[PDB]
């Protein structure tokens, strides 16, 4: 009875398993522990994850992402109508429900959001079975704490379509606290703040744990703020640099911009552990190579307003929970963007020097807690 914990994120998806007293965050056959939440359709095949993401510039109208923003919602929902303006793929109305419309093997096909996510879940299932050498059926799947019943049910249906037996849908911030064993600290009630900065979204949650029971006191954040905005600032920075050096604008070459974006995302990650990072792109535009660098200070300066602004949802969450910052017992970092040293410094300063829970890889913390929960329930 091996059950997995699955964090289905807006930008990336993670799968873990708790075995013999340790959580393994499962890497795929190329050694990558993360699967982009991307699905693509071509003349001949359906691509999932990095295979789909890697060809997005060549096949933009048939490469689907952000299905988590659509799942469980209705077509006339203002959220859906606003987000549709930013996607290169078609979203159509089927009897009040949104469907993504694509060309696939020469035919027009449409998929519900939970069908798109089930394809990502199918890959997660195969990744875990590749690692475990066994059939994997039971799963705990996480969702943001603000998801309503429709979004929870549709996320569960995505698991069911993938052949998974979803033991339970649990909140992402609750999974994070479970990962740190915060419900097992026997004592008085604990106020826990989860600071979740991902690729596309920023979620602040305050939970209270009394006698080991989780209760969501408040939620705040920004559904369109994440690591991708910081990448955007880098891309604009290097587009201006390239124009300054070569008097040429690469903006309208989708492949060039995509290759610059990929380099920028990778450089950003390096700047979390190094004070400088190199950009190396052969023949970026009209045969010209782009070899340059960026310091951590410049990356921080390019994003200073976005970084500082993450504290306003923290203040709002505390206001709604009717708690002073000093009443928070544990601060938990979640999401890949919280590895940014400036974000950690801003949040720890905000809490008057209080140490942050961050020893679990923040982009893995939700899948870690989901995997523990899956073992408890199976
Ligand atoms: N070491 C790092 N330093 C800085 N950013 C990082 C690092 N590792 C990952 N990221 C960024 O973290 C983001 C992805 O975080 P992750 O938590 O894995 O996505 P997610 O779970 O899909 N969250 P979300 O998109 O908000 O639903 C991307 O923008 C990455 O570039
Ligand atoms: Mg996540």
Q: Are residues 58 and 140 in the same domain?
A: yes
The answer on 366 and 246 residing in a single domain is: no
One domain for residues 101 and 206: no
10 labeled binding residue: yes
Look up tokens 């393994």; give the residue: 24
Clarify whether residues 105 and 235 are in a common domain: no
The closest-lying atom of ligand 1 relative to the alpha carbon of residue 363 is 17
184 labelled catalytic? no
Active-site residue, selected from the candidate residues 7, 83, 115, 157 = 7
Q: Is 159 found in the same domain as 22?
A: yes
Q: Which distant-in-sequence residues (6+ apart) come within 8 Å of 277 by Cβ?
A: 267, 268, 270, 271, 293, 294, 296, 299
Q: Is 325 annotated as a binding residue?
A: no
Q: What per-residue string of b and e applies to 152-169 under the rule 16 or more CB within 10 Å gives b?
A: bbbbbbbbebbebebbeb
Sign (positive/negative) of CA torsion 196, 202, 208, 212?
negative
Is the same domain home to 168 and 139?
Answer: yes
Report whether 316 contacts 332 (CB < 8 A).
Answer: no
For a mutational test of ligand 1's pocket, the pick from 50, 173, 198, i.e. the residue with the most ligand atoms closer than 8 A to its C-beta, is 198
Q: Which domain holds residue 106?
A: 65-119
| Residue 252 bears catalytic tag | no
Do 150 and 4 share a domain, yes or no?
A: yes
- Is the Cβ–Cβ distance between 184 and 200 less than 8 Å? no
Residue 279: phi and psi, rounded to 5, are -115, 120
Q: Assess whether 249 and 285 both reside in one domain.
A: yes
Element (H, E) at 216: strand 213-222
Residue 33 shares a structural domain with residue 14: yes
Which one is catalytic: 66, 196, 231, 363?
Answer: 196
Using the mean position of ligand 1's atoms as its centre, give its distance from the Cα of residue 338 in Å.
Answer: 8
Mutate to test the pocket of ligand 1, among 227, 235, 268 (most ligand atoms within 8 A of CB): 227
Q: What is the CATH number of the domain that holds 81?
A: 3.30.30.30
Using CB atoms within 10 Å of the CB of residue 346, give its burial: 0 to 12 exposed, 13 to 18 middle, 19+ buried: middle
**128 Cα–ligand 2 center, Å:** 18
CATH at residue 349: 3.30.420.40
2 and 28 co-located in one domain:
yes
**DSSP codes joined into one string, 118-140:** HHHHHHHHHHHHHHHSS---EEE
Does ligand 1 lie within 6 Å of residue 114's CB atom? no
What's the structural domain count of the chain? Answer: 4
- Way the structure was solved: X-ray
Q: Cα of 25 to ligand 2 centre, how many Å?
A: 13
Question: Which residues touch 308 (CB under 8 Å, ≥6 apart)?
Answer: 346
The DSSP letter of residue 329 is -
Pair 204, 115 in one domain: no
Same domain for 301 and 233: yes
Q: What is the CATH number of the domain that holds 249?
A: 3.90.640.10
> Is any ligand 1 atom within 6 A of the Cβ of residue 269?
yes
* Atom nearest to 271 CA in ligand 1: 3
């Amino acid at each position: 009875s091996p059950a997995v914990g699955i964090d289905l994120g807006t930008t990336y998806s993670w799968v873990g398993v708790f075995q013999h007293g340790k959580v393994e965050i499962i890497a795929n056959d190329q050694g990558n522990r993360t699967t982009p939440s991307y699905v693509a359709f071509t003349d001949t095949e359906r691509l999932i994850g990095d295979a789909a993401k890697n060809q997005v510039a060549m096949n933009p109208t048939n490469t689907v992402f952000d299905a988590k923003r659509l799942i469980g919602r209705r077509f006339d929902d203002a959220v859906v109508q606003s987000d549709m303006k930013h996607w290169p793929f078609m979203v159509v109305n089927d009897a009040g429900r949104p469907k993504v419309q694509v060309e696939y093997k020469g035919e027009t096909k449409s998929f519900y959001p939970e069908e798109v996510s089930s394809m990502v879940l199918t890959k997660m299932k195969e990744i875990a079975e590749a690692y475990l050498g066994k059939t994997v059926t039971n799963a705990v799947v996480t969702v943001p704490a603000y998801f309503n019943d429709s979004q929870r049910q549709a996320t569960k249906d995505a698991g069911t379509i993938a052949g998974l037996n979803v033991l339970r849908i649990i909140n992402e911030p609750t999974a994070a606290a479970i990962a740190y064993g915060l419900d097992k600290k026997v004592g008085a009630e604990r106020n826990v703040l989860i600071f979740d900065l991902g690729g596309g979204t920023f979620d602040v949650s305050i939970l209270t744990i009394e006698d080991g029971i989780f209760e969501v006191k408040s939620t705040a954040g920004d559904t369109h703020l994440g690591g991708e905005d910081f990448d955007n600032r880098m891309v604009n920075h290097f587009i201006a640099e390239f124009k300054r050096k070569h008097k040429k604008d690469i903006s309208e070459n989708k492949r060039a911009v995509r290759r610059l974006r990929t380099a920028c995302e990778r450089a950003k990650r390096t700047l979390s552990s190094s004070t400088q990072a190199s950009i190396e792109i052969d023949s970026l535009y009209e045969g010209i190579d782009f070899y340059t660098s960026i310091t951590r200070a410049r990356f921080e300066e390019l994003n200073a307003d976005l970084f500082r602004g993450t504290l306003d949802p923290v203040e709002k969450a505390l206001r709604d929970a009717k708690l002073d910052k000093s009443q928070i017992h544990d601060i938990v970092l979640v999401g890949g963007s919280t590895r940014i040293p400036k974000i950690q410094k801003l949040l720890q300063d905000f809490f008057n020097g209080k140490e942050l829970n961050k020893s679990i890889n923040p982009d893995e913390a939700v899948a870690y807690g989901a995997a523990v929960q899956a073992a408890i329930l199976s």
